[PDB]
Amino acid sequence: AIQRTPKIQVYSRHPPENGKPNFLNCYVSGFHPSDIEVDLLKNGEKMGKVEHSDLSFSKDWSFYLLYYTEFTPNEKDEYACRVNHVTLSGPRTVKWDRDM
Amino acid sequence: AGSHSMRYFSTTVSRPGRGEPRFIVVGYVDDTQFVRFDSDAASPKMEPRAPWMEQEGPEYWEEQTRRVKDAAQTFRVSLGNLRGYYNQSEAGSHTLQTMSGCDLGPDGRLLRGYYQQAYDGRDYIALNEDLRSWTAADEAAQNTQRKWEAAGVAEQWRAYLEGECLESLRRYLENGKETLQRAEPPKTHVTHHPVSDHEATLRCWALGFYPAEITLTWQRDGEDQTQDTELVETRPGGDGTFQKWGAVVVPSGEEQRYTCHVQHEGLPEPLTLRWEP
Ligand SMILES: CCCCCCCCCCCCCCCC(=O)OC[C@H](O)CO
Ligand SMILES: [Zn+2]
Ligand SMILES: [Zn+2]
Secondary structure, eight states, X not given: OOOBOOEXXXXXXXXXXXXXXXXEEEEEEEEBSSOOEEEEEETTEEOSSOEEOOOEEOTTXXXXXXEEEEEXXXXXXXEEEEEEXXXXXXOEEEEXXXXX | OOOEEEEEEEEEEOOTTSSSOEEEEEEEETTEEEEEEETTSSSOOOEEOSGGGTTSOHHHHHHHHHHHHHHHHHHHHHHHHHHHHTTOOTTSOOXXXXXXXXXXXXXXXXXXXXXXXXXXXEEEEEEOTTSSOEEESSHHHHHHHHHHHHTTHHHHHHHHHHTHHHHHHHHHXXXXXXXXXXXXXXXXXXXXXXXSSSEEEEEEEEEEEBSSOOEEEEEETTEEOGGGOEEOOOEEOSSSOEEEEEEXXXXXXXXXXXXXXXXXXXXXXOEEEOOOO
């Protein structure tokens, strides 16, 4: 069986500007096999209300998933995505970089 | 957008001793998902995943659910046959993925019909473009190919791909016309972030675009910088649009040598962008 490690992007639907409701996205792609664990984290805490897309895959048969939740950014808070998959040593945490 | 596509993507994952294999199907028209089936759902049935699919009546959903359940049973049998072909252990979990669908040309003709499978993430068997022959990856698939030639599987798929596949896609394209027959151009800009007092990251953004296909490349005096460009995967906004960016780290005094070139169906002309301080 082929094993492919997930790519991880954490980003907002719209340009982030504080006090304005927005959507926090964690897109995980390029992985195989399909079992995966994904959490959205607010200040290191697991978030509730996180939905995800239906499992689909790309032309090379690797899988992708969008995890997403309503949120409203501000100066204090930090967000991140945490992903675990059999290709990884253990759960990988990628922080939301909001000024690219 | 002379060509439009419909695709069904199914994933079947065995879990021996832990129940029958899990089966998930999703359907797309171009880059817009419109249906799903999950065998682990409470009442497994084909369900709409686009608002423009909510005007189909219950007999449509019944037929779609029956076809998906029929396919799922065939895929469960196939996973068992494949494990035996490859002399694999009965304890391990394996994956069968299938893709099917059609490309509809601007004149209504079938540009291309597809039916292909992968086993554990590697190409296994594929319907050839003539919809009457097969390409097999190995001897396991050559055995599948013979069983499918015996049962006339190619002709069953050609009938569907040349007929109902295109008729369904046509109907979806009309029912969801305002979503599907749009070309939303990307909103683009370039950002600049110093990395030392002598170098800066230039990042070229494309946001809010549909469909997903896009080209975004950095050039230095017209020369492609693909080897020195960080280019992220095109990613969904979650609202039916897509996003992408590419970035290069450049000497401060060379910043105006760099241009970002963006091509997308929704753009009248390809874009040439530069860092605008
Ligand atoms: C990659 C999915 C391919 C099928 C697996 C899951 C069913 C998916 C729902 C229907 C898709 C179109 C399949 C139904 C088309 C159909 O009924 O005809 C077939 C050929 O005629 C062979 O019998
Ligand atoms: Zn009925
Ligand atoms: Zn600079």
